[model samples]
Target: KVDEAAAKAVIKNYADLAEATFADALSTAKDLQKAIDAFLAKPDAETLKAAKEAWFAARTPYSQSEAFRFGNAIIDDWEGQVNAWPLDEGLIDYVAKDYQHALGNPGATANIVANTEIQVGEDKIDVKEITGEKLASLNELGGSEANVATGYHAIEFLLWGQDLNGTGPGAGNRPATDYAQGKDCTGGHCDRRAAYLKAVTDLLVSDLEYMAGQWKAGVADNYRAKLEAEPVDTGLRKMFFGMGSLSLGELAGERMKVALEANSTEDEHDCFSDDTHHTLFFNGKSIRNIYLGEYKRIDGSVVKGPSLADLVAKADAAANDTLKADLADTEAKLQAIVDSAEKDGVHFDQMIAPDNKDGQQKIRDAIAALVKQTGAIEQAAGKLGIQDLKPDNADHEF
Candidate 1:
């Protein structure tokens, strides 16, 4: 039997980890809330000061040495990943404005405390919607190996539960979703974006394996030479150098591989170290794989996989059923709209404006084309792989 003291230590460690995760989130919220108050509400000086104190305290620990030792880096990196989407969508500027708001008013903490949870949740990582946007923020925020690895593992639990019965071809250790509901290309809620995400995470996980192969081939010293002398903050740095500015699809493909490695974190019994006693339907293969890839496969192998775009293209092609075709069309239209919006050659500090008017028109044209060419239902059906039930798929606001 486990000793009482040891049991206490284990439980204490777990609790600490959970508490830290929550606090880090709260801190980021405080910072953004401060910004919101200054610009949005224009609160009193006293209120603003309190918000400033909360924001600074949050940042101080997050950006500090002790925090780093305590694994705050991983949390910060995760936050960055979540921030990636909104950041690219130009939402960080809005956060900054909130900070400015709180900066001017001193007593803003109470108000922020109440609203911070919601605001923070918006920026909190949407594990289900992990996209290029989220990863970009993680990169910008200096997330490293531990953070990226931990993130991939954490997300695996939520995205693909133990009950997943759908197996991915050529994707090693991928757990499939069962439930006859997943059998067809129409009647489900599978989005192209999510599909791409699954594909990319798989690729990244595999790449880590590929790297391990290289090392196992007896080239670790050379491989080690390639690794930076500095600690891996965000694997994004490696990606930036490796891909030299990858496109969205490419980035997504890479993440899929990472997803596979996440499985390695599972114990032999098919459960996490923390929840080993629980009999879950799915094994902890995905999360375990991520860390294993980081410490073993990448360090050992040389068979790193292809780029994100290449993997997704492969996935799309392999499943070239209705789902893939529709995704292609929707993506094309969405990209067109976004591109047209950006043609202004001038980025907005607030909203899309005169600077990108022509671009905006192009976006409009693209949207119109999507509506006219595909019609919403067909498009939704394609994305969901479920006919008639597309309201669930198409109902979301981009």
Candidate 2:
């Protein structure tokens, strides 16, 4: 009996989980901002490492929230400002001699950090003052996705310059002196670099704040309130649609398979930092969280509630059980890639290296698992009487 109450329960818990997840993401983002603050205060290897550590900490919370995207219009509309990826790092700063023509974006070597002005095709923009507003406007200024002037990737490139080592052990090796003040500066235009990094970090926190507030309970005109007032199935459709799209299209297709097929280290997520393994791992964890109704926050607290699993149980018990098992299996496969990366020290960039047959096989298996589980998601949506759940078959032959 997939009654109205049962459907709304899942939607309500979904909102609760979203509220908690966004709040945690906002909190860690603030911590990232502070670490960057200290790093900019007196740049050195130690402070730089701390900032990177904070950045890594920040990924888990925000990455976990990704499953809420796609189907949810509010999140989809604003997501690009902070989490957009595969950036042309050259647009932001200096890169290795070989890094020219990344994504073939004309601004690939704009070098905004070193230059006061940069050309993006026919137009030239002034980067003399690297403020959040300037960066926000400059983002994709030439209408290319790779013209990423702000967000986590921009912050990442600042912290860990260019990881020129293809299929290599180390992450981005950006030196602290890049952010150093005055005479201690290693990179030219250190002041502009510092300003740019801080502005982006601050902008990230602000973005998270707006999102968190939208999900909070007291706002009458917020997205959440509107979501609650809308028909039950409307929100539920977004919920399931998000799960399937993230599972099939975004994670399996864009994140994993594209890098595996392209065999390009530059295609991997968190490329400059080499955190692609963790990115996929946490993303997998978040989808399961949506199903099982649980999310573990950065502060070690847990958010739990009625889930899609509970809703499916009312409609079809067997479907609920099978989807649950399938999710667990997919997560294990995803974690294997992370395990290989972290313990074996064969990071994702290396795993996707063309010559590594075994590594590529492992990635292929994970991609298959995600694709398989998405079919189960489609069935699960059907059990709930939800139809037309197209999971964005991402142009790659699955």
Candidate 3:
């Protein structure tokens, strides 16, 4: 009853989406670079705001690609270099007007750009000049996990500074004066700041370029070929494994549960811009995207074809119906949180606050829905005769 041709078609469609999504991500990163170049040329408040807006725009399709992370080895292994979070802002630039240096990690306050030489414990490393090559090599500078000097969060810190408002309503308010000309600059070394921004942006563009090429055509042995070469049942199992892992462990556990339990804004993904709402919404949508075999490209066109749903339905219509219903329910719950954060004056940080009962309940509801969907994905894998798929952790509570 399992249709091998339909399964192969679904895999091809999914790979096509992976390529399209990352291609769009590269395009946006290039746009972000242009924005950065414009701001560096002018160094004014208006241009800086425009550059920040561009950064915001670039995150949309990229965030939608999160579901592609867990199941795909190429992306999962490569993602941290581009999107690591909870960065030590001081490691990259000056802190806010009254920001306190965190005591546990004394080196968290080290600003690599300003210091010609920095002390790590008893040793010194010369950092006289900054460049993309240099920044790419210093990710663990001063032995601090927070010393994430190269990535999207690093660029975010450069643009937005630190989000000083813990649970309050406001994004990072880095003044335009920080990048101003002589006698007007609030932070010293305006030239170096500009240089550092340019280097990291270029590095980001390069990183994305390498990833996009993996999914492109005209390759004798590419990602799609590798996936197609595997046994059909094994290939289908890999796809569901990605869906199940992302839903249960990655999204529910690391993203939502950890932040809620600590009530810490630092844990929020995209914390600097208060854009975690978009991340959550898009992540849920990506699962829906893969399950249904569809992807909406940034250019207003969708790539659609034979999907996992069709294969599963042919195998067991009743299981397929159940899975589709669960997928829709999961989206509704996740979208509810997103809608609240977007327009209802309930941001993600506020929702995880110790005092926000309603927000906490809504998050828990979303977690429950994700757990439910993972169960359905596991069952669908079974219906398709995929015995190797991992079990969904439905017994655990968020």
The most accurate candidate by TM-score is 2
Point to the candidate with the largest lDDT: 2
Report each candidate's C-alpha RMSD, comma-separated, in the order given.
24.5, 1.4, 2.6
> Could you tell me the lDDT of residue 370 within candidate 3?
83
| Candidate 3 lDDT, 160-244, residue by residue in tens | 8888888877888888777776788777888778888889999999988988888775575766667767777777777788788
Provide the lowest-lDDT 10-residue window in model 2: 99-108
Could you tell me the TM-score of candidate 1? 0.22
Which tens-of-lDDT digit does each residue in 138-171 have in candidate 1? 3322222222211222223222223111121111
Distance from true position, residue 386, model 3, in Å?
A: 2.4
lDDT of each: 0.26, 0.87, 0.80
Query: Where does candidate 1 have its weakest 10-residue lDDT segment?
Result: 276-285
The digit string of per-residue lDDT tens for model 2 on 119-178 reads: 888887777877888888877767778788888888988999888888877888988888
- What is the alpha-carbon lDDT of model 2 when measured against the actual structure? 0.87
Best-to-worst order by TM-score is: 2, 3, 1
Candidate 1: how large is its RMSD?
Answer: 24.5
